[PDB]
Design a protein around this ligand. Structure first.
Ligand SMILES: NC(=O)c1cnc(N[C@@H]2CCCC[C@@H]2N)nc1Nc1cccc(-n2nccn2)c1
Length: 273
Protein backbone atom coordinates (compact mmCIF):
# COMPACT_ATOMS: atom_id res chain seq x y z
CA UNK A 1 0.00 0.00 0.00
CA UNK A 2 2.62 2.55 1.10
CA UNK A 3 4.93 4.33 -1.30
CA UNK A 4 8.44 3.02 -0.68
CA UNK A 5 11.03 5.72 -0.01
CA UNK A 6 14.73 4.97 -0.49
CA UNK A 7 16.96 5.34 2.56
CA UNK A 8 19.35 7.33 0.35
CA UNK A 9 16.65 9.99 -0.16
CA UNK A 10 16.26 10.60 3.59
CA UNK A 11 18.44 12.69 5.89
CA UNK A 12 17.95 12.11 9.62
CA UNK A 13 18.38 15.20 11.79
CA UNK A 14 17.55 15.88 15.44
CA UNK A 15 15.71 13.51 17.71
CA UNK A 16 12.36 14.98 18.75
CA UNK A 17 11.54 12.33 21.33
CA UNK A 18 10.15 8.84 21.74
CA UNK A 19 6.86 7.06 21.24
CA UNK A 20 5.72 3.61 22.23
CA UNK A 21 8.60 1.41 20.94
CA UNK A 22 9.62 4.22 18.55
CA UNK A 23 12.13 7.03 18.20
CA UNK A 24 11.05 10.17 16.37
CA UNK A 25 13.27 12.52 14.34
CA UNK A 26 13.07 15.61 12.20
CA UNK A 27 14.47 14.93 8.73
CA UNK A 28 14.61 15.87 5.06
CA UNK A 29 13.35 13.94 2.07
CA UNK A 30 14.87 14.62 -1.35
CA UNK A 31 12.18 14.13 -3.98
CA UNK A 32 10.88 15.09 -7.39
CA UNK A 33 7.63 17.05 -7.06
CA UNK A 34 5.10 18.58 -9.42
CA UNK A 35 6.37 19.65 -12.85
CA UNK A 36 9.57 17.69 -12.17
CA UNK A 37 10.82 20.27 -9.66
CA UNK A 38 13.41 18.95 -7.21
CA UNK A 39 12.51 19.47 -3.54
CA UNK A 40 14.17 18.90 -0.19
CA UNK A 41 11.11 18.52 2.04
CA UNK A 42 10.98 18.65 5.85
CA UNK A 43 9.59 15.36 7.17
CA UNK A 44 8.78 13.60 10.41
CA UNK A 45 10.68 10.28 10.62
CA UNK A 46 9.07 7.72 12.96
CA UNK A 47 11.41 4.78 13.55
CA UNK A 48 10.33 1.49 15.08
CA UNK A 49 12.86 0.30 17.65
CA UNK A 50 14.96 -2.55 16.25
CA UNK A 51 14.39 -4.51 19.48
CA UNK A 52 10.62 -4.33 18.81
CA UNK A 53 10.77 -5.28 15.12
CA UNK A 54 8.10 -7.90 15.89
CA UNK A 55 5.54 -5.05 16.07
CA UNK A 56 6.24 -3.93 12.49
CA UNK A 57 2.88 -5.12 11.13
CA UNK A 58 0.90 -3.19 13.73
CA UNK A 59 3.32 -0.28 13.45
CA UNK A 60 2.55 0.10 9.76
CA UNK A 61 -1.12 -0.80 10.03
CA UNK A 62 -1.54 2.31 12.16
CA UNK A 63 -0.24 4.40 9.31
CA UNK A 64 -2.19 2.41 6.74
CA UNK A 65 -5.37 3.24 8.64
CA UNK A 66 -4.70 6.97 8.34
CA UNK A 67 -3.89 6.64 4.63
CA UNK A 68 -6.96 4.57 3.75
CA UNK A 69 -8.88 7.85 3.46
CA UNK A 70 -7.90 11.39 2.49
CA UNK A 71 -9.17 14.25 4.67
CA UNK A 72 -8.09 17.79 5.54
CA UNK A 73 -7.89 16.89 9.26
CA UNK A 74 -5.79 13.69 8.92
CA UNK A 75 -1.96 13.72 8.89
CA UNK A 76 -0.34 12.91 5.56
CA UNK A 77 1.85 9.81 5.37
CA UNK A 78 4.41 10.24 2.61
CA UNK A 79 5.54 6.65 2.62
CA UNK A 80 7.73 4.10 4.32
CA UNK A 81 11.42 3.27 4.30
CA UNK A 82 12.07 -0.41 4.99
CA UNK A 83 15.59 -0.54 3.51
CA UNK A 84 17.89 -2.81 5.46
CA UNK A 85 16.97 -3.40 9.10
CA UNK A 86 14.98 -0.19 9.70
CA UNK A 87 11.20 0.26 9.81
CA UNK A 88 10.55 3.93 9.12
CA UNK A 89 7.31 5.85 8.63
CA UNK A 90 7.71 9.15 6.74
CA UNK A 91 5.06 11.76 7.61
CA UNK A 92 4.37 15.41 6.97
CA UNK A 93 6.28 17.71 9.28
CA UNK A 94 3.82 19.84 11.26
CA UNK A 95 5.61 23.02 12.31
CA UNK A 96 3.99 23.66 15.67
CA UNK A 97 4.10 20.07 16.96
CA UNK A 98 1.58 18.28 19.12
CA UNK A 99 -1.25 19.92 21.01
CA UNK A 100 -0.32 18.78 24.51
CA UNK A 101 3.00 20.63 24.31
CA UNK A 102 1.46 23.63 22.57
CA UNK A 103 -1.29 23.88 25.21
CA UNK A 104 1.23 23.80 28.04
CA UNK A 105 3.46 26.45 26.43
CA UNK A 106 0.68 28.78 25.29
CA UNK A 107 -1.78 28.61 28.22
CA UNK A 108 -1.98 32.35 28.86
CA UNK A 109 -3.21 33.07 25.32
CA UNK A 110 -5.56 30.14 24.65
CA UNK A 111 -9.17 31.07 25.40
CA UNK A 112 -12.44 29.16 25.31
CA UNK A 113 -13.11 30.01 21.64
CA UNK A 114 -9.74 28.55 20.62
CA UNK A 115 -10.54 25.38 22.57
CA UNK A 116 -14.02 25.20 21.01
CA UNK A 117 -12.65 25.58 17.48
CA UNK A 118 -10.05 22.86 18.06
CA UNK A 119 -12.67 20.61 19.67
CA UNK A 120 -14.93 21.13 16.64
CA UNK A 121 -12.15 20.24 14.21
CA UNK A 122 -11.22 17.09 16.12
CA UNK A 123 -14.89 16.12 16.22
CA UNK A 124 -15.12 16.68 12.47
CA UNK A 125 -12.17 14.34 11.86
CA UNK A 126 -13.73 11.73 14.15
CA UNK A 127 -17.13 12.09 12.45
CA UNK A 128 -15.39 11.40 9.17
CA UNK A 129 -13.79 8.27 10.62
CA UNK A 130 -17.07 7.18 12.21
CA UNK A 131 -18.97 7.57 8.91
CA UNK A 132 -16.28 5.38 7.35
CA UNK A 133 -16.50 2.92 10.28
CA UNK A 134 -12.73 3.35 10.78
CA UNK A 135 -11.36 2.94 14.32
CA UNK A 136 -8.43 5.17 15.29
CA UNK A 137 -7.76 3.65 18.70
CA UNK A 138 -5.45 6.24 20.26
CA UNK A 139 -7.08 9.67 20.25
CA UNK A 140 -5.14 11.96 22.59
CA UNK A 141 -3.65 15.44 22.61
CA UNK A 142 -0.16 14.11 21.85
CA UNK A 143 -1.66 12.80 18.59
CA UNK A 144 -3.20 16.15 17.58
CA UNK A 145 -0.87 18.35 15.53
CA UNK A 146 -1.13 22.13 15.18
CA UNK A 147 -0.79 23.01 11.48
CA UNK A 148 -1.56 26.72 11.85
CA UNK A 149 -1.74 29.07 14.81
CA UNK A 150 -4.76 31.24 15.44
CA UNK A 151 -4.32 34.71 13.96
CA UNK A 152 -6.89 37.04 15.52
CA UNK A 153 -5.39 39.79 13.32
CA UNK A 154 -6.84 38.08 10.20
CA UNK A 155 -9.60 36.16 12.00
CA UNK A 156 -7.89 32.88 11.04
CA UNK A 157 -8.71 30.08 13.51
CA UNK A 158 -6.11 27.48 14.48
CA UNK A 159 -6.06 24.38 12.30
CA UNK A 160 -5.24 20.88 13.58
CA UNK A 161 -4.74 17.40 12.17
CA UNK A 162 -5.13 14.01 13.83
CA UNK A 163 -1.96 11.95 13.64
CA UNK A 164 -1.75 8.15 13.42
CA UNK A 165 -2.57 5.98 16.47
CA UNK A 166 0.75 4.09 16.65
CA UNK A 167 0.99 0.39 17.47
CA UNK A 168 -2.51 -0.83 18.39
CA UNK A 169 -3.64 -1.32 21.99
CA UNK A 170 -4.88 -4.72 20.81
CA UNK A 171 -1.24 -5.92 20.74
CA UNK A 172 0.50 -3.83 23.39
CA UNK A 173 1.56 -5.24 26.78
CA UNK A 174 -1.03 -4.89 29.54
CA UNK A 175 1.19 -2.58 31.63
CA UNK A 176 1.35 -0.02 28.82
CA UNK A 177 -2.43 -0.09 28.41
CA UNK A 178 -2.84 0.47 32.13
CA UNK A 179 -0.41 3.39 32.04
CA UNK A 180 -2.65 4.84 29.30
CA UNK A 181 -5.71 5.07 31.53
CA UNK A 182 -7.91 7.21 31.15
CA UNK A 183 -7.41 7.42 27.37
CA UNK A 184 -7.85 3.67 27.02
CA UNK A 185 -11.53 3.06 27.87
CA UNK A 186 -12.59 0.66 30.66
CA UNK A 187 -13.91 -2.00 28.29
CA UNK A 188 -10.49 -2.14 26.63
CA UNK A 189 -8.73 -2.57 29.95
CA UNK A 190 -11.11 -5.48 30.58
CA UNK A 191 -10.39 -6.86 27.10
CA UNK A 192 -8.19 -5.05 24.57
CA UNK A 193 -10.01 -6.94 21.80
CA UNK A 194 -13.10 -4.86 22.76
CA UNK A 195 -11.61 -2.08 20.59
CA UNK A 196 -14.56 -0.54 18.72
CA UNK A 197 -15.86 2.75 17.35
CA UNK A 198 -17.17 3.51 20.88
CA UNK A 199 -13.52 3.39 22.04
CA UNK A 200 -12.75 6.59 20.18
CA UNK A 201 -15.69 8.43 21.75
CA UNK A 202 -14.30 7.74 25.21
CA UNK A 203 -10.78 8.79 24.25
CA UNK A 204 -12.20 11.87 22.55
CA UNK A 205 -13.66 12.85 25.94
CA UNK A 206 -10.27 12.42 27.59
CA UNK A 207 -8.66 14.52 24.85
CA UNK A 208 -11.17 17.34 25.32
CA UNK A 209 -10.22 17.24 28.99
CA UNK A 210 -6.57 17.72 27.99
CA UNK A 211 -7.52 20.60 25.70
CA UNK A 212 -9.41 22.29 28.54
CA UNK A 213 -6.67 21.62 31.14
CA UNK A 214 -3.77 23.47 29.50
CA UNK A 215 -2.17 20.19 28.47
CA UNK A 216 -2.25 18.58 31.94
CA UNK A 217 -2.41 14.79 31.90
CA UNK A 218 -5.52 13.44 33.63
CA UNK A 219 -4.82 11.08 36.53
CA UNK A 220 -1.04 11.53 36.15
CA UNK A 221 -0.71 11.46 39.95
CA UNK A 222 -2.18 7.92 40.01
CA UNK A 223 0.12 4.97 39.51
CA UNK A 224 -1.14 2.11 37.32
CA UNK A 225 -2.78 0.20 40.17
CA UNK A 226 -4.64 3.33 41.23
CA UNK A 227 -5.68 4.08 37.63
CA UNK A 228 -7.16 0.57 37.50
CA UNK A 229 -9.07 1.12 40.74
CA UNK A 230 -10.28 4.46 39.34
CA UNK A 231 -12.09 2.46 36.65
CA UNK A 232 -13.20 -0.22 39.13
CA UNK A 233 -14.86 2.47 41.25
CA UNK A 234 -16.48 4.08 38.16
CA UNK A 235 -15.01 7.52 38.77
CA UNK A 236 -15.17 10.36 36.25
CA UNK A 237 -12.55 13.00 35.65
CA UNK A 238 -12.75 16.26 37.61
CA UNK A 239 -14.16 19.14 35.66
CA UNK A 240 -11.39 21.27 34.14
CA UNK A 241 -11.07 24.71 35.74
CA UNK A 242 -12.26 26.10 32.40
CA UNK A 243 -15.27 23.83 32.70
CA UNK A 244 -17.25 24.84 29.57
CA UNK A 245 -16.86 21.37 28.00
CA UNK A 246 -17.09 19.33 31.23
CA UNK A 247 -20.56 17.92 30.52
CA UNK A 248 -19.50 16.86 27.02
CA UNK A 249 -16.34 15.25 28.44
CA UNK A 250 -18.35 13.20 30.91
CA UNK A 251 -21.02 12.30 28.34
CA UNK A 252 -18.28 10.93 26.04
CA UNK A 253 -16.54 9.13 28.91
CA UNK A 254 -19.57 6.95 29.52
CA UNK A 255 -18.83 3.64 31.18
CA UNK A 256 -21.55 2.08 28.98
CA UNK A 257 -19.96 2.10 25.48
CA UNK A 258 -23.34 1.86 23.72
CA UNK A 259 -24.48 5.11 25.36
CA UNK A 260 -21.62 7.26 24.15
CA UNK A 261 -22.96 9.90 21.75
CA UNK A 262 -22.37 9.79 18.02
CA UNK A 263 -19.91 12.31 16.69
CA UNK A 264 -22.80 14.03 14.86
CA UNK A 265 -24.47 14.54 18.24
CA UNK A 266 -21.13 15.68 19.68
CA UNK A 267 -20.76 18.25 16.90
CA UNK A 268 -24.33 19.45 17.47
CA UNK A 269 -23.50 19.90 21.18
CA UNK A 270 -20.32 21.82 20.38
CA UNK A 271 -22.19 24.09 18.00
CA UNK A 272 -24.66 24.97 20.76
CA UNK A 273 -21.97 26.87 22.70
N1 LIG B 1 4.23 15.25 12.27
C1 LIG B 1 4.97 16.10 13.17
O1 LIG B 1 5.56 17.07 12.84
C2 LIG B 1 5.08 15.65 14.63
C3 LIG B 1 4.52 14.46 15.04
N2 LIG B 1 4.69 14.08 16.29
C4 LIG B 1 5.38 14.84 17.12
N3 LIG B 1 5.55 14.42 18.47
C5 LIG B 1 6.58 15.06 19.29
C6 LIG B 1 7.93 14.39 19.04
C7 LIG B 1 8.09 12.99 19.63
C8 LIG B 1 7.52 12.80 21.05
C9 LIG B 1 6.14 13.45 21.19
C10 LIG B 1 6.20 14.91 20.77
N4 LIG B 1 4.90 15.54 20.98
N5 LIG B 1 5.93 15.99 16.78
C11 LIG B 1 5.79 16.40 15.53
N6 LIG B 1 6.36 17.63 15.08
C12 LIG B 1 7.14 18.57 15.88
C13 LIG B 1 7.21 19.87 15.40
C14 LIG B 1 7.94 20.83 16.09
C15 LIG B 1 8.60 20.50 17.25
C16 LIG B 1 8.55 19.20 17.72
N7 LIG B 1 9.18 18.88 18.82
N8 LIG B 1 10.28 19.50 19.33
C17 LIG B 1 10.59 18.90 20.45
C18 LIG B 1 9.67 17.88 20.67
N9 LIG B 1 8.81 17.88 19.66
C19 LIG B 1 7.80 18.23 17.06
Amino acid sequence: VFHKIRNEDLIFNESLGQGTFTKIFKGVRREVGDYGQLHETEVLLKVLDKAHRNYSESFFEAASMMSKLSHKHLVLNYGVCVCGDENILVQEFVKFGSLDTYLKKNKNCINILWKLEVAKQLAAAMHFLEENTLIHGNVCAKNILLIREEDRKTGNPPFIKLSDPGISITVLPKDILQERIPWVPPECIENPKNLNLATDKWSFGTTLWEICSGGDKPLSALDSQRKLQFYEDRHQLPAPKAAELANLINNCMDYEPDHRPSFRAIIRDLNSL
